[PDB]
Ligand binder design. Structure first.
Ligand SMILES: Nc1nc2c(ncn2[C@@H]2O[C@H](COP(=O)(O)OP(=O)(O)OP(=O)(O)O)[C@@H](O)[C@H]2O)c(=O)[nH]1
Ligand SMILES: [Mg+2]
Lengths: 1183, 188, 393
RNA sequence: GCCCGGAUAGCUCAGUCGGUAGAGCAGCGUGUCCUUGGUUCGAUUCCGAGUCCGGGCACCA
């Protein structure tokens, strides 16, 4: 029974298998886009068959490997969940924790993978958390183990900036082209410098400030500033963008081509303006050289890191030496690495110092074990080191076995890092090719020469006796970049002479190719004594003997060969000296554990280091409760604080919420949300603080469940905080708490995490839930499948791409989902199936008719089907007891969207305030910016009611203002705002005056005798007190739940209930209706329980009607008395009996609810009396 | 004075190391080799492409400061005839330099040498070169092993040629090659 | 054998437990040699305890070793147990023959995983009293560290219902005492005094039907087969009939001689570590875990309902839940049997640290009774500790 | 008691870089590979434990 409930909860509510399939398909389609990501990364995910798992080799990049593992985890989770739906607890647990293992892989990944994966993987985090919580109900009950927030209805809240920001910024600066240029610059600075959340380029603020300053402005200084912009700032920004798109893995030029075009326009218009006031190409010669030099530096670092084999060799030696101990040797060492000989320890330390980062990243605890075993002196005792219990557990184990079990993982990590470096090098190579293509295209597809370029001087060799590692590294990279320059020069001369040989076996026609080839090796030709030849070639190539330059080809080739050989020799020598310096620096430093430092940085360690719980507690204790005391009236504050100045912290997690006023209950809920938020943040920080130097931190997949549960609780409490924050008097402090939690939006594994209600008949809802449990619809599904297969089988002249096939299949799925919730009348299903058959016949004959006839026929089909679906939806609405015009409009919208898709892929008081602000702004401007001021005024005063009566007054005042276009209109607007403010204040428990004076101040600030306004507000308050005195909600609810016979029915019903628990015993049961006739839903339910014959459907329907009557009151006592999940569990008559008993046993809580309503009226009358006292005091004092 | 200028430029180039390009042989205005020099009535070396820019700011001699016009400052190729031979001598000197380094580079990577390579051995000391110094004609000695030898036999050497310390300067490329050789042998 | 083992003093079964390489064997040798210096004694050497070629090669104790000594008012049979995590089972068997344990904790190390594991397992097999011996105190001169070890061991003992605040702790050095340093022989004598005083003489069951868990079986050449163990209850006499009950079908046999540390005994009493000769049984027809019982007084069972606490990850237990069909190993007094587990209604997965009322059915019938504690080990670690709530079948 | 090695269809077996079990016989195989756990994105495969089977050591109340 419970397992069936769990299965249905997975299949229907969470829809975990469908979510996993959608996430996997979206991630795979995005990473194989070929328009957002490059082909190198895309080809790693090409599969022979879609049923085979991706294979993670040792030769694929780290990010490709982690993406493959994540995709495989998603596929296996979907497979397991689908297998569960095809029929359990163990399989669901395993699938959930496989997803959690993938999440842990993401946690330990870098920023690039995290941002690639986060948008897709954020869709199932709440689903995973709810699945884990449902699984937890199969474990033994553990009260107080969690004690977190009560997740009432979280199932309801189940849910390109980088490429556009720089173009938008440079468009804004293009727009910035006496006093006019004095506020526009400040406006742009405020608009752009305030923007954040995408500054992965860790300098962007410097660039934006520098461009603003330089665009604010003899001509030599201006030219110097222009050249500095063109050569120092803009190339640096372009290079940083290229590094972003290289680490990302995107296609060459994805987010650097639009930005480049934008800044090209910006710099060209700057140059034009400067020329007008008194060169500018952005790719003249040296921008290209600097871009290429940065690209080559990155490429050479990548190639050096890829070709390095010292770390892998050291790891191999370490694991070979560890594996050289047989059983006898290990027994002699007592299976501890600390008991081996000192020379062996020195060798192991030398090996481990070179690959410690990988080992510590994968195994942060075995790293500590190794470091302590190898480096701690043997004289020292274990007890004096103060090890923790689990560290001692790791210490007592076979050290050799533990270290050897990490061999495959560590070696795979090292080889995958090398493969990642090589893959990045390939990415950079394609980046340079694409940059060359774009630079060629941007100017004219033509290149220009100049006989003034400095010659190519090979770097001088200098072998410093002893310098830090970075010094030799810089020299090595300089040598490698020079090698690459010479290599390009030799390729250029080869192509130059090949084209010369093949074009004329110097007054030629195709001089562009010769120019582009000679510009590659001009410095090298200039290095030799060939200035005359170069100056003769440049002019003869830009304006016009080639038979003589062919002579000095072997000389140039041998010079390039000799210089590249020398640079290769020197790079090898400096690499050897780098190895020596690295060995010396490793020898100097001691061996120190690195596991905790890496664990502190993953994703949750970074969040934990923010210590947001401390700030949340500070706000909760120092700023929140003091504001509550200051602004809440003493009557409502006495409920929250027994002492008068501090909250009742001994009872913060309130659990009743039904014995209080709506304002008191809302305040208690807000306090509960703040408390849960603080506790969750502090628990997440404690579980991710790694500051114990005598402890080990094991990397496992089974901690992610706790992290996800804590994140879910935090986000649910924050949801309720913003929900309670949409009140006029509570916006400030709630916004302050939101600003405190601001550094939680942006983290990939939390994100928004949440969303950030029809009324149908009770019998209809119960039948729908029963149908959901037990799961024309088959007919329409088959018809849609036939349509889809007819579209897919279209092999006519009108070729249809597979993308259009996917689009039509998705549209068919959406249409099936939309129509699965419709009931069709007699003959309506025949009409809709005939229309669908005609549609599929037309689709099978798309190429058999002209496009005009095809579009006309499909439009007619769309119209007919939409009309039939409106008729069916209206019939369903009438038969389901819903409200007309709600479901039919949605059905028509779905049908219209589906038809538009197929035709495309086949070849409010807020408005009142807005108009008030617009009229008030247009009044003086027509009798003597506007949109921004109106928007600010509306935003600052969002959340007012205006009532049904003041709407007419506002309309009349606006009409009078229009007719007249002095302070009477202003006074009327002010008093209407004040009345709305009093309404808002009395709705809360606020002290009189506060929000009203705040809104009055805002209104008068936006604007740029009081006795009557004060008297009017006093009359408003007096009539409010009278209306509150006239309220009888408590009596009404009491009578509705049980009439004026509850006591009598109880008295004559207790003996019957006692007798219920022999032949003539039923006789009185027959006569009980002659003396105990019910008149109230609760007494009717009591009689229904006394009947006890729940097999019949008549009293089942009667119970459904009674529960429909009693639900609006039962929902306040408990959240489980809903109309979706409570009815879903009513399947057997025993379930009906159990539900009847459950509702029966809450009579004391209905009494508590009605007493709470009475106390609500009692508090309200005191609020009005205090208010009127305050206004009469203000009126008498003001004179 | 036209002949005396080239006479003393020739002696200055001859006595000095050919790799030390004289600062007067190159035009001081542009610091470039003589390819288009001009003359003055007294006789000085400049460049036409540089003299046209210089005379615009100051219509006088760059060095003697006498008021001079562009008409008199005519191209003087008589100073070119020496320059070429000098530079080719320089080139010929460099024609050994690279080779004297290139083999050295190979010598820097050879293993298990039976004896110290000849290019690494000082002929006047028969020992490993600590700091190499290169003669004006293309031979390499050790700095101290040449200084002490010269002061022992009175600034004479080999065939009694007038050679002194100031006329022979350190060989930097060979010095770095010696450093590489020492670093590689020290690895054992 | 030769002597007759005259009965003069109360006999107590003690043993040494603790983490690997903490000095249990050295402590046993030191106790024997010091009691031989001060009294009659036998003065066993270290090489006479860990004498097996496997133990000599590995350097560790692998199987339990049995010695005896005599204080002025008591006679002790001492079981030296292995401390390596791989031979825990052997320890358990030795821990089944202990009326008391000396928890040897090295002062240079403090309590370790096997200290806690041995405490829990000895509690499960019925060790009711523990005396801590702070060994290697000659290598630690600090006094704060000694008190830190003392408080840690006391809290560990109280964690498993032992009276940690009352447990005696002896700060000695078994290596020095074996060497002959009188200052440390005084500490060993204090330990012997604590053994005499702190551990009470148990109330033996000499009237109940005879019961003997089997710990070891020997094939004495020319005589037959011998089963050794501590008589749980009753008296076994020469010529009486016994039955073997346990893993296989129950067999019948006669007792034709009882010994005790290679000395002829007329009758083995309850609580005494004896050895019994069985007539006409091959060594391959008997295993450790079976039971010598009076004919027709013990019925082996396969299915029992039990209350089990599942250890947390911090206690050396599981770190993941287990589901239905989990097949761990159940350790009763000298027996270990594989069993399947059925969870109570509404429970599907058991988290570490949980308390469960589970129904366990074993693959072989074993002699067990209501209220018999047991351990649950799987994959080389102790995963739970339970008590047989009732016997189903 | 401590090692070592096997267990894959009804029978004989191949499956080793960890990616959904196949060759013959027998009459087109839900054979998750003895079972149970662990590690892993993923286990017939790697690690551990246990159940049978075998053949090497041990001890000897
Ligand atoms: N310094 C010092 N060393 C000791 C002391 N007691 C034992 N040792 C040494 O610790 C080592 C442990 O050997 P055992 O006494 O046999 O340890 P164990 O308790 O039997 O542990 P297992 O052999 O694994 O069962 C021996 O080699 C002794 O030399 C002591 O009191 N002081
Ligand atoms: Mg021992």
């Amino acid at each position: 029974r419970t397992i069936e409930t769990y299965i249905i909860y997975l299949k229907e509510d969470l829809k975990i298998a469908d979510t996993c399939k959608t996430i996997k398909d979206g991630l795979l389609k995005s990473i194989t886009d070929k328009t957002h990501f490059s082909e190198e990364l895309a080809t790693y995910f090409e599969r022979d068959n879609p049923n085979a798992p991706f294979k993670v080799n040792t030769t694929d990049p780290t990010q490709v490997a982690v993406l493959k593992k994540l995709l495989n985890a998603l596929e296996n989770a979907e497979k397991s969940f689908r297998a569960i739906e095809n029929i359990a607890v163990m399989v669901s647990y395993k699938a959930v924790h496989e997803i959690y293992a993938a999440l842990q892989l993401i946690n330990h990944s870098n920023s690039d993978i995290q941002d690639i994966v986060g948008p897709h993987i954020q869709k199932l985090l709440p689903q995973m958390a709810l699945a884990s919580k449902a699984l937890g109900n199969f474990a033994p009950e553990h009260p107080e183990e969690s004690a977190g927030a009560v997740l009432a209805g979280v199932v309801n809240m189940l849910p390109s900036n980088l490429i556009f920001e720089l173009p938008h910024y440079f468009e804004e600066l293009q727009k910035l082209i006496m006093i006019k240029k004095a506020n526009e610059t400040k406006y742009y600075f405020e608009q752009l410098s305030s923007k954040s959340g995408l500054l992965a380029i860790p300098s962007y603020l410097s660039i934006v400030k520098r461009l603003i300053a330089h665009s604010t402005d003899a001509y030599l200084d201006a030219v110097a500033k222009l050249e500095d912009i063109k050569h120092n700032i803009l190339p640096q920004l372009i290079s940083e963008l290229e590094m972003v798109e290289e680490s990302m893995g995107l296609k060459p030029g994805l987010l650097t081509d639009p930005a480049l075009e934008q800044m090209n326009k910006y710099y060209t218009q700057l140059a034009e303006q400067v020329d007008n006031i008194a060169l500018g190409v952005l790719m003249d010669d040296v921008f290209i050289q600097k871009r290429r030099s940065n690209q080559e530096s990155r490429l050479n670092e990548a190639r050096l890191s890829s070709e390095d084999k010292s770390v892998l060799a050291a790891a191999n030696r370490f694991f070979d030496k560890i594996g050289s101990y047989n059983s006898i040797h290990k027994a002699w060492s007592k299976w501890s690495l600390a008991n081996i000989s000192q020379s062996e320890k020195d060798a192991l330390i030398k090996e481990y110092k070179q690959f410690q980062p990988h080992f510590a990243a994968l195994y942060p605890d075995i790293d500590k074990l190794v470091v302590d075993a190898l480096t701690q002196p043997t004289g020292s005792n274990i007890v004096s080191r103060l090890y923790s219990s689990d560290y001692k557990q790791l210490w007592s184990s076979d050290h050799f076995k533990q270290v050897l079990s990490c061999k495959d993982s560590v070696l795979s990590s090292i080889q995958q890092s090398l493969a990642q470096s090589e893959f990045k090098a390939k990415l950079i190579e394609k980046t340079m090719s694409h940059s060359e293509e774009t630079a060629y295209s941007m100017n004219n597809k033509t290149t220009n020469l100049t006989t003034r370029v400095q010659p190519f001087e090979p770097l001088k060799f200098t072998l410093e006796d002893d310098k830090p590692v970075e010094y030799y590294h810089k020299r090595v990279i300089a040598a490698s970049n020079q090698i690459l320059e010479l290599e390009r020069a030799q390729k250029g001369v080869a192509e130059f002479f090949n084209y010369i040989q093949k074009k004329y076996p110097l007054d030629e026609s195709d001089k562009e190719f010769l120019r582009k080839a000679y510009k590659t090796f001009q410095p090298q030709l200039l290095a030799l004594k060939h200035d005359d030849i170069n100056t003769r070639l440049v002019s003869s190539l830009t304006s016009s003997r080639l038979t003589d330059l062919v002579s000095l080809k072997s000389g140039i080739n041998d010079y390039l060969n000799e210089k590249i050989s020398d640079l290769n020799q020197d790079k090898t020598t400096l690499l050897d000296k780098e190895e020596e310096a690295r060995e010396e620096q490793y020898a100097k430093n001691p061996l120190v554990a690195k596991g905790a430092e890496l664990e502190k940085q993953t994703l949750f360690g970074q969040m934990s280091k923010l210590k947001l719980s401390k700030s949340v507690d500070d706000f909760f204790n120092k700023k929140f409760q003091t504001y509550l005391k200051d602004n809440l009236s003493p009557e409502v504050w006495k409920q929250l604080s027994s002492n008068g100045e501090t909250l009742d912290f001994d009872k913060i997690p309130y659990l009743e919420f039904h014995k209080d006023s709506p304002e008191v209950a809302m305040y208690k809920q807000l306090i509960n949300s703040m408390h849960y938020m603080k506790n969750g943040l502090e628990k997440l920080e404690s579980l991710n603080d790694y500051g114990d130097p005598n402890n080990i931190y094991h990397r496992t997949r089974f901690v992610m469940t706790t992290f996800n549960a804590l994140v879910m609780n935090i986000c649910f409490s924050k949801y309720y905080v913003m929900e309670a924050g949409n009140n006029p008097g509570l916006k400030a402090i709630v916004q302050e708490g939101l600003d405190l939690l601001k550094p939680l939006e942006g983290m990939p594994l939390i994100g928004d995490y949440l969303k950030t209600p029809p009324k149908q008949n009770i019998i209809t809802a119960w039948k729908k839930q029963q149908a959901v449990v037990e799961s024309d619809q088959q007919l329409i599904s088959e018809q849609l499948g036939k349509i889809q297969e007819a579209i897919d089988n279209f092999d006519g002249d009108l070729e249809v791409s597979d993308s259009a096939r996917e689009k039509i299949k998705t549209q068919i799925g959406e249409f099936a989902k939309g129509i699965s919730g419709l009931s069709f009348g007699p003959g309506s299903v025949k009409k809709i199936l005939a229309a669908l058959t005609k549609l599929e016949t037309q689709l099978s004959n798309l190429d058999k008719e002209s496009p005009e006839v095809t579009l006309g026929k499909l439009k007619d089909i769309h119209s007919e089907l939409n009309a039939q679906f409106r008729a069916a939806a209206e019939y369903t609405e009438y038969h389901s007891g819903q409200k007309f015009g709600s479901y039919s409009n949605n059905i028509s919208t779905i049908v219209s969207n589906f038809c538009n898709g197929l035709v495309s892929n086949l070849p409010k008081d807020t408005s009142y305030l807005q108009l008030i602000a617009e009229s008030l702004y247009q009044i003086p401007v027509k009798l003597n910016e506007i949109d921004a001021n109106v928007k600010a005024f509306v935003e600052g005063l969002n959340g007012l009611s205006f009532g049904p009566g003041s709407v007419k007054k506002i309309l009349s005042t606006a009409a009078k203002l229009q007719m007249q276009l002095l302070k009477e209109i202003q006074a009327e607007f002010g008093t209407i705002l004040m009345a709305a403010a009093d309404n808002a204040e009395f709705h809360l428990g606020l002290k009189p005056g506060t929000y009203s004076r705040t809104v009055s101040e805002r209104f008068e600030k936006f604007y740029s005798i009081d006795t009557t306004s004060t008297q009017k507000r006093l009359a408003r308050e007096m009539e409010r007190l009278e209306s509150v005195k006239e309220d009888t909600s408590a009596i009404d609810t009491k009578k509705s739940i049980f009439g004026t016979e509850h006591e009598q029915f109880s008295t004559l019903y207790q003996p019957y209930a006692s007798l219920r628990h022999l032949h003539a015993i039923d006789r009185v049961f027959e006569e009980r209706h002659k003396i105990n006739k019910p008149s109230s839903p609760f007494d009717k339910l009591r009689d229904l329980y006394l009947d006890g014959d729940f097999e019949k459907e008549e009293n089942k329907e009667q119970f459904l009607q009674l529960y429909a009557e009693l639900q609006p009151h039962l929902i306040k006592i408990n959240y489980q008395y809903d109309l979706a999940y409570f009815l879903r569990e009513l399947q057997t008559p025993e379930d009906f009996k159990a539900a009847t008993e459950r509702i029966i046993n809450d009579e004391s809580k209905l009494q508590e609810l009605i007493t709470g309503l009475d106390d609500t009226k009692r508090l309200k009358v005191k609020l009005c009396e205090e208010r009127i006292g305050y206004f009469i005091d203000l009126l008498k004092k003001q004179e | 004075h036209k002949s005396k200028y080239l006479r003393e430029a020739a002696l200055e180039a001859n006595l000095s190391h050919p790799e030390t390009t004289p600062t007067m042989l190159t035009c001081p205005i542009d610091s470039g080799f003589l390819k288009d020099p001009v003359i003055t009535p007294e006789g000085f070396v400049y460049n036409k492409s540089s003299i046209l820019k210089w005379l615009e700011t100051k219509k006088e001699d760059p060095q003697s400061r006498k008021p001079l016009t562009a008409k008199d400052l005519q191209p003087f190729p008589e100073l070119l005839i020496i320059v070429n031979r000098f530079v080719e001598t320089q080139t010929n000197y460099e024609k050994l330099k690279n080779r004297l380094v290139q083999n050295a580079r190979v010598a820097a990577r050879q293993k298990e040498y039976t004896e110290i390579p000849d290019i690494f051995l000082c002929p006047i000391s028969k020992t490993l070169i600590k700091t190499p110094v290169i003669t004006a004609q293309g031979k390499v000695y050790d700095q101290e092993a040449l200084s002490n030898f010269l002061i022992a036999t009175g600034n004479k050497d080999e065939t009694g040629k007038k050679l002194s310390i100031d006329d022979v300067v350190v060989f930097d490329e060979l010095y770095q090659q010696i450093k590489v050789y020492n670093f590689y042998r020290k690895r054992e | 054998s030769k002597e007759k083992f005259e009965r003069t003093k109360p006999h107590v079964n003690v043993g040494t437990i603790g983490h690997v390489d903490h000095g249990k064997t050295t402590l046993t040798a030191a106790i024997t040699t010091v009691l031989a210096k001060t009294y009659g004694g036998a003065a066993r050497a270290f090489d006479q305890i860990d004498n097996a070629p496997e133990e000599k090669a590995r350097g560790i104790t692998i199987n339990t070793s049995h010695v005896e000594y005599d204080t002025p008012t008591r006679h002790y049979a001492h079981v030296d147990c292995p401390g390596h995590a791989d031979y825990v089972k052997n320890m358990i068997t030795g821990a089944a023959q202990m009326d008391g344990a000396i928890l040897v904790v090295a002062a240079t190390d403090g309590p370790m995983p096997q200290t806690r594991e041995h405490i829990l397992l000895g509690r499960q097999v019925g060790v009711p009293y523990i005396i801590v011996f702070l060994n290697k105190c000659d290598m630690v001169d600090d006094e704060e560290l000694l008190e830190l070890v003392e408080m840690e061991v006391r809290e560990l003992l109280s964690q498993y219902d032992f009276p940690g605040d009352d447990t005696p702790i002896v700060r000695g050095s078994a290596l020095k005492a074996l060497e002959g340093d009188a200052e440390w022989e005084a500490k060993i004598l204090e330990l012997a005094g604590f053994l005499d005083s702190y551990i009470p003489e148990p109330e033996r069951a000499i009237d109940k039907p005879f019961l003997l868990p089997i710990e070891d079986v020997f094939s004495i050449s020319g005589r037959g087969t011998v089963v050794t163990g501590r008589v749980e209850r009753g008296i076994i006499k020469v010529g009486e009939e016994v039955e073997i009950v346990g893993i296989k079908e129950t067999q019948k046999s006669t007792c034709t001689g009882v010994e005790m540390f290679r000395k002829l005994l007329d009758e083995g009493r309850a609580g005494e570590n004896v050895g019994v000769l069985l007539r006409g049984i091959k060594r391959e027809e008997i295993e450790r875990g079976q039971v010598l019982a009076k004919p027709g007084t013990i019925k082996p069972h396969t299915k029992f309902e039990s209350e089990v606490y599942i250890l947390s990850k911090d206690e050396g237990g599981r770190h993941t839940p287990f589901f239905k069909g989990y097949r761990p190993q159940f350790y009763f007094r000298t027996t270990d049997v594989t069993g399947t587990i059925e969870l109570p209604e509404g429970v599907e997965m058991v988290m570490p640290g949980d308390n469960i009322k589970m129904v366990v059915t074993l693959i072989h019938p074993i002699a067990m009774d209501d209220g018999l504690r047991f351990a649950i080990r799987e994959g080389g670690r102790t995963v739970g500790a339970g008590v047989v709530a009732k016997v189903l079948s």
